[PDB]
Homo-oligomer: A and B are copies of this chain.
Amino acid sequence: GTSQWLRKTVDSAAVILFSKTTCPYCKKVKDVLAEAKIKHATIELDQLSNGSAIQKCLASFSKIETVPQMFVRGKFIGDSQTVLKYYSNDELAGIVNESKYDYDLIVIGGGSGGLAAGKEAAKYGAKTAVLDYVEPTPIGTTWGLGGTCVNVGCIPKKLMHQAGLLSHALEDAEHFGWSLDRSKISHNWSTMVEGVQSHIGSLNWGYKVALRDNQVTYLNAKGRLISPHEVQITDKNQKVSTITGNKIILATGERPKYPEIPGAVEYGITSDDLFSLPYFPGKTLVIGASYVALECAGFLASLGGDVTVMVRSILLRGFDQQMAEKVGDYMENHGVKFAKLCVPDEIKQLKVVDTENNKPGLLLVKGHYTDGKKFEEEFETVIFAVGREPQLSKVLCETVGVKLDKNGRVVCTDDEQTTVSNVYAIGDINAGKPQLTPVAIQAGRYLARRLFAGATELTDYSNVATTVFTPLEYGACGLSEEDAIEKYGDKDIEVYHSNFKPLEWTVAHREDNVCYMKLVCRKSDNMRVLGLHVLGPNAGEITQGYAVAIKMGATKADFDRTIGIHPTCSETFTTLHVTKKSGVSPIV
């Protein structure tokens, strides 16, 4: 086992040094490498239980057994004397820059995973290039480096969530003694957008400065894998060229879907355009039922918009459906309208968008209900949030041999390898993995360490916690309640649950039995917690820490023997006692 590991480590590392912590000849080579600004991986054999065998297996590559041993791209370079000799003779730089390929690593896609992979690999000497390019939306929207989350995702959408929550802060402030009158305050959309966009712009810039400071070539151009080690690039002026790389990481992500109906691409928008929209949407129709659909409808309504959501079948397919319905009911009771079991057939234009005065157009939406009734109504803006998909045919010449699934996502082993042995995929395009920014970062960074630093640690994709930032937030970790019953049988499942009420809602006179939380547990496994769910303020901050306990296999007794922090919302999890089978009510 040790042997096979050392062979894979030596073959892929760019510059790697085997060492011991207490050896002056190792120090001597380290000081030489630091002086000449040579970046490299370092493995200290005296801090590995396996290191004595490893020190013996290095003689397969170098025919010696002492430390230090320096390797470049699979080739043994020398012990202490030879490296110093290479240095003294002005030979060391040309040896470490020697390669079959232009780059040790080419990343296609400069988003969450792409930039994480690229920065980490550069730290261990891997000569790295990150490629990024933003195909404009149908109306021409575009943005800078950083990928979906930074530019048209988690970041601008949580800040617009914050401004939505500040409306209820203003309401709440009257009851706590502040003098303002909420009903004489209005919201200015473009002022909000300028502040959000300004923060994004500093992220774009910060990422560029990060790549430059890690010696990463950044190319603003479209990448096409034409063979295992050859990537074709087309830049902004349509100039076409080829670069080669030893390892290839695919991190191109996804883009929004449009329903195939007349008028949709012409007259609707998506989340890609919403976050830099120069005008307030006005009376808005959201077509879709995903978490994207509900978060966007949610903050548009809190900023004073007239909002309808058109629901084909159910809300939040794939999430715990009781939690989904609580989520939806909260929105409906605070000014979001729902058009349930409704599908659109057509969008007709009645006014073009007023580019000069920054005012929305006007649209007519025709649809029908399953009961036969026609849907017909006017909206100033129509947003589509009906899914997302990758566009790999534009990236992957099918003759290279990368296996895709029926949805067009890349099939990988559990270390992210594709069916082409030097090509990997991370993030939203990795088939079957949760589509989330921290996941893609963990995958990129861990993969970079396996390739260029001999690491073994894999990314763990199970029981990853999520949060939906609807007006009342919803956090979950683990199995939904229905899936657990599905997997183990109703008799083996015990669900503890309770309503609650934040102390902050008392003086502000908000609802009594609306916030909610439950633990789904397995009876035959010491009451193991299979899934946790909470609906309430600050649901993300509440949920995060419990994810660590659940990863370690927490049981109902672990929740019970811990003591709460008071006064908090999250403490209700430490004193739960009402089961569902008992039939007792969860209310306060």
Q: Which residues from B are CB-within-8-Å of A155?
A: 503, 567
CB contacts under 8 Å to B, within A458-510, are: 460, 464-467, 475, 503-504, 506-507
A173 smallest CB distance to B (angstroms): 5
A21 smallest CB distance to B (angstroms): 14
A123 smallest CB distance to B (angstroms): 12
Asked whether any CB of chain B lies closer than 8 Å to the CB of A216, the reply is no
Asked whether any CB of chain B lies closer than 8 Å to the CB of A76, the reply is no
Asked whether any CB of chain B lies closer than 8 Å to the CB of A187, the reply is yes
CB contacts under 8 Å to B, within A497-527, are: 503-504, 506-507
Q: Considering the chains assembled together, what is the distance between the CA atoms of A545 and B548 in angstroms? A: 8
Whether B438 pairs with A566 at a CB distance below 8 angstroms is yes
A575 smallest CB distance to B (angstroms): 8
Asked whether any CB of chain B lies closer than 8 Å to the CB of A191, the reply is yes
Known A-B contacts A154-B567, A549-B545, A571-B438; A195 and B176 likewise in contact (beta carbons under 8 Å): yes
C-beta contact mask, A193-210 vs B, less than 8 Å → 1, else 0? 001101100000000000
Closest chain B residue, CB of each to CB of A443: B563
Whether B195 pairs with A175 at a CB distance below 8 angstroms is yes
Whether A176 pairs with B199 at a CB distance below 8 angstroms is no
Whether B179 pairs with A187 at a CB distance below 8 angstroms is yes
Asked whether any CB of chain B lies closer than 8 Å to the CB of A559, the reply is yes
Q: Which residues from B are CB-within-8-Å of A224?
A: none
Contact of A167 among B178, B548, B558 (CB under 8 A): B178
Q: Considering the chains assembled together, what is the distance between the CA atoms of A275 and B344 in angstroms? A: 57
Closest chain B residue, CB of each to CB of A177: B192
Binding site of A, secondary structure by majority: helix, strand, loop or mixed? helix
Q: Considering the chains assembled together, what is the distance between the CA atoms of A326 and B416 in angstroms? A: 43
Whether B544 pairs with A548 at a CB distance below 8 angstroms is no
Whether B561 pairs with A543 at a CB distance below 8 angstroms is no
Contact of A503 among B158, B179, B563 (CB under 8 A): B158
Known A-B contacts A545-B548, A570-B541; A159 and B565 likewise in contact (beta carbons under 8 Å): no
Q: Considering the chains assembled together, what is the distance between the CA atoms of A196 and B567 in angstroms? A: 15
Q: Considering the chains assembled together, what is the distance between the CA atoms of A562 and B554 in angstroms? A: 14
- Most chain B beta carbons < 10 A, residue from A436, A504, A548: A548
Q: Which residues from B are CB-within-8-Å of A169?
A: 166, 169-170, 173
A9 smallest CB distance to B (angstroms): 21
Asked whether any CB of chain B lies closer than 8 Å to the CB of A552, the reply is yes
Chain A interface size, as a band, is 35 or more
Whether A438 pairs with B507 at a CB distance below 8 angstroms is no
Q: Considering the chains assembled together, what is the distance between the CA atoms of A439 and B571 in angstroms? A: 12
Whether B154 pairs with A566 at a CB distance below 8 angstroms is yes
A188 smallest CB distance to B (angstroms): 5
- Most chain B beta carbons < 10 A, residue from A438, A542, A554, A565: A565
Q: Considering the chains assembled together, what is the distance between the CA atoms of A573 and B544 in angstroms? A: 9
Closest chain B residue, CB of each to CB of A189: B177
Contact of A563 among B158, B442, B475, B558 (CB under 8 A): B442
Q: Which residues from B are CB-within-8-Å of A198?
A: 507
Closest chain B residue, CB of each to CB of A548: B549
Q: Which residues from B are CB-within-8-Å of A176?
A: 159, 162-163, 166, 192, 195
Q: Considering the chains assembled together, what is the distance between the CA atoms of A56 and B507 in angstroms? A: 57
Q: Considering the chains assembled together, what is the distance between the CA atoms of A437 and B503 in angstroms? A: 15
Asked whether any CB of chain B lies closer than 8 Å to the CB of A149, the reply is yes
Asked whether any CB of chain B lies closer than 8 Å to the CB of A320, the reply is no
Q: Which residues from B are CB-within-8-Å of A162?
A: 176, 503-504, 507
Q: Which residues from B are CB-within-8-Å of A187?
A: 177-179
Q: Considering the chains assembled together, what is the distance between the CA atoms of A192 and B177 in angstroms? A: 5
Contact of A543 among B551, B552, B565 (CB under 8 A): B565
Q: Considering the chains assembled together, what is the distance between the CA atoms of A303 and B192 in angstroms? A: 27
Whether B159 pairs with A507 at a CB distance below 8 angstroms is yes
Q: Which residues from B are CB-within-8-Å of A506?
A: 159, 199
**Nearest 9 pairs between A and B by C-beta?**
A545-B545, A177-B192, A163-B176, A545-B546, A169-B169, A544-B570, A548-B549, A438-B564, A540-B568
Q: Spell out A's residues near B (CB within 8 Å).
A: 149, 154-155, 158-159, 162-163, 166-167, 169-170, 172-173, 175-180, 185-189, 191-192, 195-196, 198-199, 303, 436-439, 442, 460, 464-467, 475, 503-504, 506-507, 538, 540-549, 551-552, 554, 558-559, 561-571, 573-574
Known: A544-B571, A548-B559, A552-B558. 6 other contacts (CB 8 A): A155-B567, A166-B176, A167-B178, A176-B192, A545-B570, A549-B552
